Amino acid sequence: LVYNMTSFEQGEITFDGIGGLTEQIRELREVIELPLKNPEIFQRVGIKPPKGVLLYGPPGTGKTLLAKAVAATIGANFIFSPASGIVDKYIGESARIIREMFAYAKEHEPCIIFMDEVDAIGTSADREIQRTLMELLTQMDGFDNLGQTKIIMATNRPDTLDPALLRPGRLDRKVEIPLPNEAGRLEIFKIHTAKVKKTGEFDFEAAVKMSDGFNGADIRNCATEAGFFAIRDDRDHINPDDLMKAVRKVAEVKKLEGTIEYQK
Amino acid sequence: MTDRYSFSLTTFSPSGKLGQIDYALTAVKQGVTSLGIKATNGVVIATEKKSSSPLAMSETLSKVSLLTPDIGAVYSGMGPDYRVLVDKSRKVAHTSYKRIYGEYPPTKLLVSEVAKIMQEATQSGGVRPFGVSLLIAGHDEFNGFSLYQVDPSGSYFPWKATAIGKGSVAAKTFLEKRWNDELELEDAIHIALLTLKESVEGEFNGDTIELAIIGDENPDLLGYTGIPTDKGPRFRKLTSQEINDRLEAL
Amino acid sequence: LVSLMMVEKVPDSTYDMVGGLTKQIKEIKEVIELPVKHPELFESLGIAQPKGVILYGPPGTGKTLLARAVAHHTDCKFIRVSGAELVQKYIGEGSRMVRELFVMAREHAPSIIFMDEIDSIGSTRVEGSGGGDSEVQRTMLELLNQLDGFETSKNIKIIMATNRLDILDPALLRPGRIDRKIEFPPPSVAARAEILRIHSRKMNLTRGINLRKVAEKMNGCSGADVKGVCTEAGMYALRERRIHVTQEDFELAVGKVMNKNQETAISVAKLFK
Amino acid sequence: SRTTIFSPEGRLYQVEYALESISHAGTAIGIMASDGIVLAAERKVTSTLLEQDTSTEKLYKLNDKIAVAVAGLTADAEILINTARIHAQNYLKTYNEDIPVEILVRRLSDIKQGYTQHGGLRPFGVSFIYAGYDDRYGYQLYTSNPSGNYTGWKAISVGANTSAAQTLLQMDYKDDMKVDDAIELALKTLSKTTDSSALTYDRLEFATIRKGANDGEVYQKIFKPQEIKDILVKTGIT
Amino acid sequence: DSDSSISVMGENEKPDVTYADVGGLDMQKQEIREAVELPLVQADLYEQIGIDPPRGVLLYGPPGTGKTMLVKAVANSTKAAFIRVNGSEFVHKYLGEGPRMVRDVFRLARENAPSIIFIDEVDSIATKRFDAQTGSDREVQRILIELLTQMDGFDQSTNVKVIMATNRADTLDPALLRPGRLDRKIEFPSLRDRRERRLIFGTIASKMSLAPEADLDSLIIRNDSLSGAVIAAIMQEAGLRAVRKNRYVILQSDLEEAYATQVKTDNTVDKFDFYK
Amino acid sequence: DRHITIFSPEGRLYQVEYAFKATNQTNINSLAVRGKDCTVVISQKKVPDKLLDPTTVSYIFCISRTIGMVVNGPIPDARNAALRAKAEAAEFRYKYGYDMPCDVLAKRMANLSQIYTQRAYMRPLGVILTFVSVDEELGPSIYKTDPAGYYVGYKATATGPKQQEITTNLENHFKKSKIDHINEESWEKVVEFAITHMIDALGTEFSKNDLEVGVATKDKFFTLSAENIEERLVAIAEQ
Amino acid sequence: TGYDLSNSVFSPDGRNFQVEYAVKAVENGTTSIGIKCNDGVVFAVEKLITSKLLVPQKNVKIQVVDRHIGCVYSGLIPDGRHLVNRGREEAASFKKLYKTPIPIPAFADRLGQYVQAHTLYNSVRPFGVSTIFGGVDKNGAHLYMLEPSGSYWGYKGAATGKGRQSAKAELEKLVDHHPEGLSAREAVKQAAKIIYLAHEDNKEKDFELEISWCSLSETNGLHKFVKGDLLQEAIDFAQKEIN
Numbered sequence A: 001l002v003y004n005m006t007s008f009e010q011g012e013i014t015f016d017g018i019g020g021l022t023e024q025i026r027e028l029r030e031v032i033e034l035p036l037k038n039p040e041i042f043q044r045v046g047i048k049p050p051k052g053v054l055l056y057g058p059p060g061t062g063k064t065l066l067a068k069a070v071a072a073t074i075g076a077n078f079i080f081s082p083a084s085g086i087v088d089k090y091i092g093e094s095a096r097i098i099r100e101m102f103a104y105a106k107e108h109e110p111c112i113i114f115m116d117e118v119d120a121i122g123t124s125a126d127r128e129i130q131r132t133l134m135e136l137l138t139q140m141d142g143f144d145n146l147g148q149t150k151i152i153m154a155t156n157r158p159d160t161l162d163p164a165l166l167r168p169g170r171l172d173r174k175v176e177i178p179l180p181n182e183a184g185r186l187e188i189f190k191i192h193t194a195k196v197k198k199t200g201e202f203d204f205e206a207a208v209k210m211s212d213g214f215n216g217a218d219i220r221n222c223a224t225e226a227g228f229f230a231i232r233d234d235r236d237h238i239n240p241d242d243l244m245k246a247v248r249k250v251a252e253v254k255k256l257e258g259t260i261e262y263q264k
Numbered sequence B: 001m002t003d004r005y006s007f008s009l010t011t012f013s014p015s016g017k018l019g020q021i022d023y024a025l026t027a028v029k030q031g032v033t034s035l036g037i038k039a040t041n042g043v044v045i046a047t048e049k050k051s052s053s054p055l056a057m058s059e060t061l062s063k064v065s066l067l068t069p070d071i072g073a074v075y076s077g078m079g080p081d082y083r084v085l086v087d088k089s090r091k092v093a094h095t096s097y098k099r100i101y102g103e104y105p106p107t108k109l110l111v112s113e114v115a116k117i118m119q120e121a122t123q124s125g126g127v128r129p130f131g132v133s134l135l136i137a138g139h140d141e142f143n144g145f146s147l148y149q150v151d152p153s154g155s156y157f158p159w160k161a162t163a164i165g166k167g168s169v170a171a172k173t174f175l176e177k178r179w180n181d182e183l184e185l186e187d188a189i190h191i192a193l194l195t196l197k198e199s200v201e202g203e204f205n206g207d208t209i210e211l212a213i214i215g216d217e218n219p220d221l222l223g224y225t226g227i228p229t230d231k232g233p234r235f236r237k238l239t240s241q242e243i244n245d246r247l248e249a250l
Numbered sequence C: 001l002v003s004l005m006m007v008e009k010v011p012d013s014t015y016d017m018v019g020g021l022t023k024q025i026k027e028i029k030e031v032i033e034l035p036v037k038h039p040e041l042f043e044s045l046g047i048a049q050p051k052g053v054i055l056y057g058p059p060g061t062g063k064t065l066l067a068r069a070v071a072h073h074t075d076c077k078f079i080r081v082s083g084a085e086l087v088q089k090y091i092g093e094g095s096r097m098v099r100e101l102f103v104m105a106r107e108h109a110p111s112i113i114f115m116d117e118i119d120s121i122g123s124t125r126v127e128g129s130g131g132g133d134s135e136v137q138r139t140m141l142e143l144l145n146q147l148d149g150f151e152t153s154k155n156i157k158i159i160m161a162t163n164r165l166d167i168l169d170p171a172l173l174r175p176g177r178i179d180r181k182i183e184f185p186p187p188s189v190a191a192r193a194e195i196l197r198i199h200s201r202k203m204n205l206t207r208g209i210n211l212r213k214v215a216e217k218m219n220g221c222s223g224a225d226v227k228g229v230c231t232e233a234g235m236y237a238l239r240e241r242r243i244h245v246t247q248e249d250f251e252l253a254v255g256k257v258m259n260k261n262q263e264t265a266i267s268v269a270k271l272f273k
Numbered sequence D: 001s002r003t004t005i006f007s008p009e010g011r012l013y014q015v016e017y018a019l020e021s022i023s024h025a026g027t028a029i030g031i032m033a034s035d036g037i038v039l040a041a042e043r044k045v046t047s048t049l050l051e052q053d054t055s056t057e058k059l060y061k062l063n064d065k066i067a068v069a070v071a072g073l074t075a076d077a078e079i080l081i082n083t084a085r086i087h088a089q090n091y092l093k094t095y096n097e098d099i100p101v102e103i104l105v106r107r108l109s110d111i112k113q114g115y116t117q118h119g120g121l122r123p124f125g126v127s128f129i130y131a132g133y134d135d136r137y138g139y140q141l142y143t144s145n146p147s148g149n150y151t152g153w154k155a156i157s158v159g160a161n162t163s164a165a166q167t168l169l170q171m172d173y174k175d176d177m178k179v180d181d182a183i184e185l186a187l188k189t190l191s192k193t194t195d196s197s198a199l200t201y202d203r204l205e206f207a208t209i210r211k212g213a214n215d216g217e218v219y220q221k222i223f224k225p226q227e228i229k230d231i232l233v234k235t236g237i238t
Numbered sequence E: 001d002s003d004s005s006i007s008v009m010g011e012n013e014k015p016d017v018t019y020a021d022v023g024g025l026d027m028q029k030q031e032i033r034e035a036v037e038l039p040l041v042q043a044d045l046y047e048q049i050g051i052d053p054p055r056g057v058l059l060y061g062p063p064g065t066g067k068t069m070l071v072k073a074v075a076n077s078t079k080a081a082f083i084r085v086n087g088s089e090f091v092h093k094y095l096g097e098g099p100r101m102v103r104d105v106f107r108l109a110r111e112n113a114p115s116i117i118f119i120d121e122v123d124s125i126a127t128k129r130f131d132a133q134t135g136s137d138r139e140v141q142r143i144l145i146e147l148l149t150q151m152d153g154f155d156q157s158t159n160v161k162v163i164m165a166t167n168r169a170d171t172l173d174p175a176l177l178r179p180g181r182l183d184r185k186i187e188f189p190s191l192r193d194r195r196e197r198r199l200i201f202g203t204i205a206s207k208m209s210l211a212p213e214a215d216l217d218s219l220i221i222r223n224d225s226l227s228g229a230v231i232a233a234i235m236q237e238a239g240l241r242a243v244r245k246n247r248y249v250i251l252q253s254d255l256e257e258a259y260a261t262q263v264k265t266d267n268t269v270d271k272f273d274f275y276k
Numbered sequence F: 001d002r003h004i005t006i007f008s009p010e011g012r013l014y015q016v017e018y019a020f021k022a023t024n025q026t027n028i029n030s031l032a033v034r035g036k037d038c039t040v041v042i043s044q045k046k047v048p049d050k051l052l053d054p055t056t057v058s059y060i061f062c063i064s065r066t067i068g069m070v071v072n073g074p075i076p077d078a079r080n081a082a083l084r085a086k087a088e089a090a091e092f093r094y095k096y097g098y099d100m101p102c103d104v105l106a107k108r109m110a111n112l113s114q115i116y117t118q119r120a121y122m123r124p125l126g127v128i129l130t131f132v133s134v135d136e137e138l139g140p141s142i143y144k145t146d147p148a149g150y151y152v153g154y155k156a157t158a159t160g161p162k163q164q165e166i167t168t169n170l171e172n173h174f175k176k177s178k179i180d181h182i183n184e185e186s187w188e189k190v191v192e193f194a195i196t197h198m199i200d201a202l203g204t205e206f207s208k209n210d211l212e213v214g215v216a217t218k219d220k221f222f223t224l225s226a227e228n229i230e231e232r233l234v235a236i237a238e239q
Numbered sequence G: 001t002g003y004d005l006s007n008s009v010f011s012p013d014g015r016n017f018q019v020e021y022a023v024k025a026v027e028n029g030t031t032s033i034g035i036k037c038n039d040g041v042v043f044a045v046e047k048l049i050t051s052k053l054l055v056p057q058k059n060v061k062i063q064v065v066d067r068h069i070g071c072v073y074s075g076l077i078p079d080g081r082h083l084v085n086r087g088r089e090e091a092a093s094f095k096k097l098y099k100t101p102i103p104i105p106a107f108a109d110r111l112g113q114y115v116q117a118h119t120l121y122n123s124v125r126p127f128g129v130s131t132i133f134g135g136v137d138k139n140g141a142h143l144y145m146l147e148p149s150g151s152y153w154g155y156k157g158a159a160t161g162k163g164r165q166s167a168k169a170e171l172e173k174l175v176d177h178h179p180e181g182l183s184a185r186e187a188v189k190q191a192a193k194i195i196y197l198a199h200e201d202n203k204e205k206d207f208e209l210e211i212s213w214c215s216l217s218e219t220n221g222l223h224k225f226v227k228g229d230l231l232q233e234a235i236d237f238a239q240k241e242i243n
């Protein structure tokens, strides 16, 4: 039934769909090249693999999209499992379900697993829940072997917890990804102008001009925003003054609920 | 413009255990290490100036402070709850004693006049305590040297040697070896540094950490002359170089 | 179920393996021994062959190790719950077993029970937070003192036990529902003396031996420490290939207790004198 | 917890913690013969490097006929003495006679409930021993607590198992029990109640009163380390 | 008996670690096998001396430091039974799953005569004593006491004496550790090991590879924060660089940045923000 | 605990770590250096609407004919600090007969912040500061403050959300020439180094209005206006 | 959540949401503007009627603080009037001093820290009002607006109430059309347009207008309300802009 998680993999999809900050995109791919295509190298040195990794990027920047693309590169089963989604008042229901998670997981390798919003993870109640945080970290590299099954924690609250990050030999590649510049903002329109008509000119100069703080989701929503009332023109191309009639208010909801983004 | 928080900020426990000071004495430990040792020839103190950035001076920051010409002091824990306390002691040594018996006081009578405000920070209303426990050195022609540790509750230990902070107990586990009675001062810096070398992870240079001592009469500091009677400032601080001259000499 | 029941395989202990403990047997056997040894004798007066008793005291004692030997030299049975096993993750399983419990001993008058721990059935309070466990402490006490318990108290004495005393329900105790209690304290020094005589029976025509010269020194609470130091004393001899043993090799074994006798670090807080 | 108000059935929330809290503190006893007075206290710590030699902490004096002992905070008691000291010599510039105690405590401890009574301020984490003399009621002995109620006695303890320790004086004390016949009870009263039966002259502190000087004068004698160190042998410890 | 909550671990499916994968640690590794590996064999001597076999241990120290590395090379060299467990399975969502199983746990051992078990961690279980505030927590302590009587309540010798792994060893609910219940307790430090850092820093280098154009045992000289689990974690990362550039074996300039590439975050306003 | 200035359960002050973050409401970065016999100070000047009078907008104040200061915080919180400065200069010289230094006057207002952490009638201030002055006894100098009381000089420094973007960039510089302050005399010919460093290190290009400037000239402090900046910007004509 | 209950309790976000709730109180009020003309300032405001029983032209909402000033507000009627009664004595205690009228920067420097003082303490109510003022000094023209967090900036124009979104973009549509300089009389026309143009958020109800300006030219830079045909000249005009 966790099929509901682990059933978004089969259709092959390109790793090209996001440019982003390429050097990080060069990082996680090259380090995960190794088990699949060139595992000879670990043998010629005789060094253990990367026992799973994590990352950080603030919200709504293709993080799950990034993860959801990699499993289609090679044929894993990309799961979807919110941290808070697995949260129940029942004590063992926390620590029982996780054990059944790895269970079906190791029942099917070479595959892949994912988490995002784990940042939530002397008083009476709290003295039991740290054990969950003390359990699973043990279940990474406590006693058992792990062949071809890995994990990412991809949060938006990087003040998560000292001990999981206190000894970064358990996990590694504790990477970051910040938000775009024009350097990033510009090329992102190329994929987002891919399957749509347009006039043809260096129109994206307004892109570097403004949008200094948006992310990828809304600019994508800004694209379709322009196309809606661009049909009043109804032309067989699209103009960059079109979008300008809505770039304001999208920022005014991007204005709404101002939240900060530090990296750690 | 209206005051209504005049209640106490303080709370009894079932079994004593006054709350919001027992929490205070975490930060005193979270702060840096610092120490103090005596001997009949003289007295010493020291700390470690943890310069945060590579930008800040250490000249501007007084992790060691002068109280009178014959006293020093030092802390660990928090700073702004230390800077204020100096001046509220300096203004007291005069406004109770020094303008009233002429001579500056012995060391402990001063200490009665810091706990007598430190206490008021708690039993009064609308306030918190100073998150600090600091140290004093001693001198007087009628009772001699001494150290005197204080603490935010209002107590004050005496000592022959001690230390505090993020490396305290290890030192207290150490110095009970190093201390003895047959002591001059020129020896006391080796052990004091040699102590404070082991409890550090960063740089260990003379321009990084300040300390100071209790020497003997030094009329060159006094500014004027002609009166052979006067006793000059026994207190004194060291420079950048004279630290390193010891360090090379190990 | 009869797994809880008594045994055709009794343990092999004895109440003369138990040095230092000298007076308590005289103070507690009789309620378990005498009027059941002679009900006509007791019935000459017949005051009340009371209900069970209780023992309180720290660990380090062998209250257990006492209770293992009493099941030898009995004339009666000695059942065991393997404490707190009676409860399950349900409701109805509670009272039936207790109903099954008494009757299992009604058929055996000269026969008794054992608890070790009643820290888990103590101090019932409820405003929505609580548990079914509180339900079962009643019915046992109900069938302890009711129309059908005194016939057991005609047939039965019992005992409870724990290591922490005042953390339970006083509404439990109607003194008479439990007619006597006792302390198992930590030992005296000289009480400790005859202990190591028991367990170190391994010297080999050796000499220069001063068994008194160890409770000379101790300020502990346990008697089991006499074994903890003894048992690892021989480990030294075990590693160094010489079976023999002496005082000093046996003495620094307290160095293991150099932690225990000194693990309790101390605070410097002179807030109040 | 709103120091003023009572329980739902006629009790207080705080102050019963306080005189129960002070039980954590050290020991301070105090007795009397018909000849002289003895006092004692065991310092909370007796580590070796620090200045236990001149450590005058548990036992202070007030004037040249009185001595006390202390139990509670180092500080919240440290102010009362500076207070009450003034109320002694400020008795004198009015009247020029010596001070009696029976005015002092009755005119002192009423300050205590003054902070239970109002202001929302906590009471004083302190209890005392008293000692002294007037020419009208002879030798004397008194005590106190954070409430204010004071009680005259012939011999008393405080602190750790004082209820237990007060037993130890119960059988042995004598009406005409002289000083050197009564002094040994004190440290023997402590030689049992101690945590560290390993005992050090350093760990405790001592004081005396007599009428040693002829012409009816007295002595606020206080005893130094090596003296009581040798006194300790007299009852035969080592 | 099936008792399908923990199976016989290591019949043919086992890890593959060695004793010698460790560096030193013989200051503790000696004593443990001085009460584990030998009682397999020289039981007669324990009958010649020692009224019982000294056994029962509580291994502790800070976690992520070296404890669980040692737990299981022995598993490679038992010639006997062995069991693992997640050290908080006992916190079941409902009640009773433990007390129904823990009594069936040692039921697995007594039939599997002789054996051994272990535990992940018990930081949640250490609880000296509470006043009964709610059943939400009291299902903990009842398990702990039941564990104890299950250990040396009645069954004395034929059982196996066991371990206690943790992340701290001061919260431990006392009356558990005893001269009879355990008779042993050990740990290992964290401060600088000039004797051990000098060899453990390259004991794995035998497992690793290196082509020295110079000497690379010099970061060991740089003693500030000698730890125990990083000191192999670094080269667990540093080796990923020559490969990142097709270099076939690393150089000593490749790793010194790899040392600091693990940035030590000595500067963080999260430390500066709190007190001041 | 999470509403007032008592000591935390563990022993930090949750009401104070907030206040540092109460500054970062604006996405603004400023900078501080030391000249040869002068100094410099600058910050962004955002204007996301058309109708303002940027004649009026300012964070950089004027307290004497000697000194100055800056702010990265809510300006209402700033002005109460701004006013209390002008006062606390006067009462000094009126009592001693000479102008107000910086090292002292921070040591006053640093004492002041403490008794906003030691009582509870008061709201603290979600700002920080970088005072600037020459000194006839100490020379070009600056001093920074937090809302707690930690105040320290800096040979050169900056502040805003983006300290990491530049503060590394500066430490890289002094590890390239290795002296405290610059080896260039005129203030006019060193502000270029500042604006050369912002846009290059991690900053974004600027225009005429986008920035504002202060200089603690010998016996003179004062701001700058449009062409006074545009000219100084066209120093980039050569580089 | 639990931090949003009283003054002077910052957030993890670094704020006190309580004043940010005040912004919705002042959001629940009438429209009001004031424009920086070429030589002075202008004032105009919305004043809605509930019943006919309300008299016209006896219930002004402008307030004067001294000769060379006009001030208005929107939202809480009393609270925006209190600080005027503080204003009316402050500058009076400043003309007391060097015997000269008061500047406008003197005004906010003597007000904009006041309301701040009503956000330091756990014992008072932040002034839930947004506020305007203007006038003339020796230097020339000025204009300012206030927000309840103490802030204020020199504008060319402002707006409050639920007449925000109309006027702001409209003034964006004005200024580029006329940046050269707008004298006093002419803005008195174009101002009253906007209020008729901005009532459409609340065109369920009715009102009547109220205007005031002050010119260095016309009225010797004194304050002088409107009462005459000039008003009637503008309403006859402003209907055409909405016509």
Ligand SMILES: Nc1ncnc2c1ncn2[C@@H]1O[C@H](COP(=O)(O)OP(=O)(O)OP(=O)(O)O)[C@@H](O)[C@H]1O
Pocket (backbone or CB within 6 Å): C017, C018, C019, C020, C021, C058, C059, C060, C061, C062, C063, C064, C065, C116, C162, C163, C195, C222, C223, C224, C225, C227, E149, E152, E153, E178, E180, E181
């Ligand atoms: N006098 C004694 N005679 C025999 N054994 C003793 C004696 N004193 C201590 N012991 C030892 O003490 C151990 C058990 O005592 P302890 O009270 O510490 O735990 P326990 O009684 O088993 O715990 P609980 O009562 O909570 O179940 C046994 O191993 C036993 O050998």
Ligand SMILES: Nc1ncnc2c1ncn2[C@@H]1O[C@H](COP(=O)(O)OP(=O)(O)OP(=O)(O)O)[C@@H](O)[C@H]1O
Pocket (backbone or CB within 6 Å): A138, A141, A142, E021, E022, E023, E024, E061, E062, E063, E064, E065, E066, E067, E068, E069, E070, E120, E121, E165, E166, E167, E200, E228, E229, E230, E232
């Ligand atoms: N001597 C060593 N040889 C090999 N690996 C080591 C050594 N010391 C530490 N490590 C590595 O450090 C990592 C963390 O240490 P380890 O897990 O042993 O600490 P721990 O005390 O067992 O923590 P926990 O009990 O929570 O598992 C392990 O994965 C282990 O591989």
Ligand SMILES: Nc1ncnc2c1ncn2[C@@H]1O[C@H](COP(=O)(O)OP(=O)(O)O)[C@@H](O)[C@H]1O
Pocket (backbone or CB within 6 Å): A017, A018, A019, A020, A021, A059, A060, A061, A062, A063, A064, A065, A066, A188, A215, A216, A217, A218, A220
């Ligand atoms: N670096 C990027 N380049 C192009 N598009 C992006 C980038 N980051 C995010 N997007 C767009 O923003 C959206 C992010 O949505 P999603 O991945 O569901 O949330 P999250 O980013 O939290 O994982 C996607 O639709 C994607 O097209």
